């Protein structure tokens, strides 16, 4: 199986042992864009444009 | 007031090509005669 690639922007979470736990594609949904612009998986309460 | 570069440098890099291993072929247990003079070409390696 082959799929094309594109220059995207992803957010990576590292644990204490340096193992990637979860990732969020910033071009998937609006909550993903909020997590991208806040640089965190638990964004605070606010109005994001 | 004002706020030197030491010449000591540390250069480490992983090689991209294997070793030539010329000493293994020269120290072989089989020594060819002057009439044979076997030949081995070494290329794309580090020595």
């Amino acid at each position: 199986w082959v799929t094309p690639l594109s220059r995207r922007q992803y957010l990576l979470n590292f644990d204490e042992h340096g193992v990637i736990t979860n990732a969020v594609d910033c071009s998937s949904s609006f909550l993903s864009e909020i997590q991208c612009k806040t640089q965190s998986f638990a964004p605070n309460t606010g109005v994001y444009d | 007031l004002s706020g030197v570069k030491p010449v000591a440098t540390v250069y480490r890099r992983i090689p991209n090509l294997p070793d030539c291993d010329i000493d293994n072929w020269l120290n072989n247990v089989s020594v060819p005669s002057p009439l044979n003079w076997e030949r081995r070409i070494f290329s794309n390696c580090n020595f």
Binding site: - | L1, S2, G3, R12, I14
Partner: protein, 49 residues
């Protein structure tokens, strides 16, 4: 073989020849605060912190 932080700098590495780890520490680079009178031979230096 290298250790990086969230800011993007390197703070450690591993040697593949001796199998020993190290921590890269930044080197000192600071200035001196000197107090000088109207007519004096040498001012008074102060290395802060």
């Amino acid at each position: 073989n290298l250790l990086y932080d969230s800011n993007g700098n390197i703070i450690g590495f591993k040697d593949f020849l001796t199998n020993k780890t190290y921590t890269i520490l930044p080197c000192y680079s600071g200035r001196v605060s000197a107090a000088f009178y109207q007519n004096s031979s040498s001012p008074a230096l102060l290395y802060r912190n």
